Design a binder for these strands. Structure first.
Lengths: 136, 50, 178, 116, 79, 113
RNA sequence: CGUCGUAGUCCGGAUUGGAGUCUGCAACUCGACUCCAUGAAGUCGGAAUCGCUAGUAAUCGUGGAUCAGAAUGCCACGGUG
RNA sequence: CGCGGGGUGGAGCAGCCUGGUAGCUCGUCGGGCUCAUAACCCGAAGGUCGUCGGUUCAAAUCCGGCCCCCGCAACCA
RNA sequence: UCCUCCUAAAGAGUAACGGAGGAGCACGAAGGUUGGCUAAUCCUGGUCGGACAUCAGGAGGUUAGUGCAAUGGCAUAAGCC
């Protein structure tokens, strides 16, 4: 399961997304995904999406992932009132925007991300899909 | 800082006594440095403290 | 004290009559020995070197001086300003004066005497002539029982390669091995 | 680079002289030569100098790196200083020691006239 | 957690800025804890215990572009 | 003056610091002392410069210390490569004195604090 | 008589290779004797305790048995006491 | 809630605070006393000093984390 | 109560039980000043040497250090002789 390295500081700030940022050129492979939308992505979502692909791709590839959790989130008991204060770290998250490629592939010809992505898109936010390699 | 004050004596007639707070926790030796006083204005020799 | 006369007459210099060198600035030259004598575990004695203070100047033509440490706490015990050795460095005439006892009369103790191995050679032809421990030379009051310490000697050259630094081993004879 | 250490000592001096501006006397020496030059109050050019290159010294001195040759330049730059009336002149030693040939030059410059 | 404090009241800002009046002495730059990023050049110097490049003569600032790469000096103008 | 001894004691007979150490043996190393004018009964001090030149003359006749230990060590290291009985017993810490490790192997074992 | 100390010693030479010498299918492994060389341990010794009344304790040599080929163990002998 | 301690060859705790540095009484095995085991006197072996790191020339101690325990304890809409 | 870096908005003080930490002292020397010096770390090799040991060479450097904290700077050294 995905559990990122302990942060230098005990807690972090969540931060705002600009909802664009180009990152469409594949550099760990030759093809990937289309994002075309904006939102928040969690560690459990990218591990559940990895599970969906791991079950369909068996051991071929591997597949490289350009999204990784960036922040831990603070969580506390539900009954604590509004005011004081921030709890301990629980789940880890990242931000996604239209120019992201998310996942990068090359060693998996025609059995992943070439005809459909529906089975992995069902685990994710922003109704994602596959992309074809950019050559010109 | 929380250290003992002891004033140096002049070897001659002088209206001032220079106040020392010299640490004596590793240095038992005496302090002799010369100071200025605005009366005779030819420097004063100060002795015997801590 | 005669090497100073011969090193100026032909030793690695008559070479210049058959090889393409217009000055001694392209030929091998020897002018330095950066001597040292270590104290080792002397901090657990602290009384013998307190009286053997000129015992390195007994073999070197310069003024004795105790070297002070550059380390204040160590896993072998040291203290700030503790004396850690003695140098009594050889250059020029005192280096040629000192070299006249090396290999010629330094034979009271041996460990190979056929050339050992070319350590610290620097790719130039830097030659070993050390004795590991002092062997005692004839001067004054040298026949008695007296203690001896660690002594190692390398003769370093201005040559550019051991192909040309070896012109010294073509002017003198000493046992050599690579 | 032991040559650069002399230049560092000159950077120290050049920075220290920069707040003075004004007329400046620079002394420079080498193992065979010595010279001294007076720099203008705008810093952009020389006014007068003395150097062991002149046949007035170089034909009379048996070696130009000598003490008496440093004194010959000191006694010439002091003589040319009196010709151009220079006062409030700040001294500069080009990263060298003052002791030795720069002192032996200065000692004779204050023998040919005013201090210096 | 908490107790990170930082404390209260500190400034040392905006005094080394724009056109000067050229008739009293000026700080030139009051940037905090200066040891080599700026320094002084030309006829002026500043060696104060609070790292101020305060000029000791009356004049205006040059806002000079000379000096090696990212090291630029506090200097007074000729007028 | 000394020729083969390295220990500190002074003014002894010409055998204790002259023979039976590091490689010099005792069989030919003592016959040379009469040519140097040195007596072998009762403590003596006649070995100095001059006398010792008669002893510094002996060259290439014997070997001492690490080069004599090299001679035996290589003469066992050639066997430690092989399946020989003394090969493994010098590759591993095992006795060769025909010992009973039930009773006495004390030199090969050690303390016995 | 000569010689020597409070030093793991003049010593010791226990250990480790290389040569040999003997007996014997055979001594590699488990045998003895020898030589040139190398080289370590031992300077009273755990809680605690052992034994007899004079040629006894204490201590040094000599012999035999076993045996193709070795004992320091086994059985005996005398000197000093 | 919140507060204050403990974690030390196998067991249970001194040690720490005061820096020049790994232990005691038992335990385990083997002895000594004995016909023998206990009582009792000796001999021997083994510490991630919970444990990951930090800090320092330098610790188990300085000190953050990740766990395991106890004592006061829930004495407020 | 005091103090740094940041939040704090390319003009300034600055909020919320905001973010990383400290200060109630230290040093008569660790202060003044002249001239110098230049790390660190690692590799090489040198009896007594468990193990870091010496002096010299090579690579190499706003990377060593700065009384203490966080921060900015560093040979014109504010770092040490």
């Amino acid at each position: 399961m995905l559990q990122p390295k302990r942060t230098k500081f005990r807690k972090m700030h969540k931060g705002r997304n600009r909802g664009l940022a180009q990152g469409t050129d594949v550099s760990f492979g030759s093809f990937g995904l289309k994002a075309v939308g904006r939102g928040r992505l969690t560690a459990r979502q990218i591990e559940a999406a990895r599970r969906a692909m791991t079950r369909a791709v068996k051991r071929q590839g591997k597949i490289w992932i350009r999204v990784f959790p960036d922040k831990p989130i603070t969580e506390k008991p539900l009954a604590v009132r509004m005011g004081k204060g921030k709890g301990n770290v629980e789940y880890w998250v990242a931000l996604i925007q239209p120019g992201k490629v998310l996942y990068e592939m090359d060693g998996v010809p025609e059995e992943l991300a070439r005809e459909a992505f529906k089975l992995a898109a069902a685990k994710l936010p922003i109704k994602t899909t596959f992309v074809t390699k950019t050559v010109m | 800082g929380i250290r003992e004050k002891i004033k140096l004596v002049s070897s001659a007639g002088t209206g001032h006594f220079y106040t020392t707070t010299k640490n004596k926790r590793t240095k038992p030796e005496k302090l002799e440095l010369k100071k200025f006083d605005p009366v005779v204005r030819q420097h004063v020799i100060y002795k015997e403290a801590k | 004290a005669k090497l100073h006369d011969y090193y100026k007459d032909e030793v690695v210099k008559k070479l210049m009559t058959e090889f393409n060198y217009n000055s001694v600035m392209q030929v091998p030259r020897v002018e330095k020995i950066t001597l040292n004598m270590g104290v080792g575990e002397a901090i657990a004695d602290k009384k013998l070197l307190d009286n053997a203070a000129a015992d390195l100047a007994a073999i070197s033509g310069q003024k004795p001086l105790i070297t002070k440490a550059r380390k204040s706490v160590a896993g072998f015990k040291i203290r700030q300003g503790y004396p850690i050795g003695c140098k009594v460095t050889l250059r020029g005439e005192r280096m040629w004066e000192f070299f006249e006892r090396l290999i010629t009369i330094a034979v009271p103790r041996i460990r190979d005497f056929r050339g050992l191995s070319a350590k610290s050679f620097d790719g130039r032809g830097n030659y070993s002539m050390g004795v590991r421990e002092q062997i005692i030379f004839p001067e004054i009051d040298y026949d008695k029982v007296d203690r001896v310490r660690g002594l190692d000697i390398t003769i370093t050259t201005t040559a550019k390669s051991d192909e040309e630094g070896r012109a010294l081993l073509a002017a003198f004879d000493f046992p050599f091995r690579k | 680079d032991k040559k650069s250490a002399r230049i560092r000592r000159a950077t120290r001096a050049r920075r220290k002289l920069q707040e003075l501006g004004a007329t400046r006397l620079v002394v420079h020496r080498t193992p065979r030569h010595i010279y001294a030059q007076v720099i203008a109050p705008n810093g952009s050019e020389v006014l007068v100098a003395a150097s062991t290159v002149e046949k007035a010294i170089a034909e009379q001195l048996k070696y130009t790196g000598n003490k008496d040759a440093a004194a010959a330049v000191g006694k010439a730059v002091a003589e040319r200083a009196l010709e151009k009336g220079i006062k409030d002149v700040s001294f500069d030693r080009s990263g060298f020691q003052y002791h030795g040939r720069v002192q032996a030059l200065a000692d004779a410059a204050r023998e040919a006239g005013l201090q210096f | 957690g908490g107790s990170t404090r930082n404390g209260r009241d500190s400034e040392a800002k905006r005094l080394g800025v724009k056109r000067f009046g050229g008739e009293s002495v000026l700080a030139g730059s009051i940037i905090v804890r200066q040891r080599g990023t700026k320094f002084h050049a030309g006829a002026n110097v500043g060696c104060g215990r609070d790292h101020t490049l305060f000029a000791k003569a009356d004049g205006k600032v040059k806002f000079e572009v000379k000096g090696p790469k990212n090291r630029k000096f506090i200097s007074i103008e000729a007028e | 003056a000394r020729i083969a001894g390295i220990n500190i004691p002074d003014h002894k007979h010409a055998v204790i610091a002259l023979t039976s150490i590091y490689g010099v043996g005792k069989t030919r190393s003592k016959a040379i002392l009469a040519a140097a004018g040195i007596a072998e009964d009762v403590k003596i001090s006649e070995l100095s410069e001059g006398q010792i030149d008669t002893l510094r003359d002996e060259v290439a006749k014997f070997v001492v210390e690490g080069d004599l230990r090299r001679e035996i060590s290589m003469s066992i290291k050639r066997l430690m490569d092989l399946g020989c009985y003394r090969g493994l017993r010098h590759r591993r810490g095992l006795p060769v004195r025909g010992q009973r490790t039930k009773t006495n192997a004390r030199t090969r074992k050690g303390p016995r604090k």
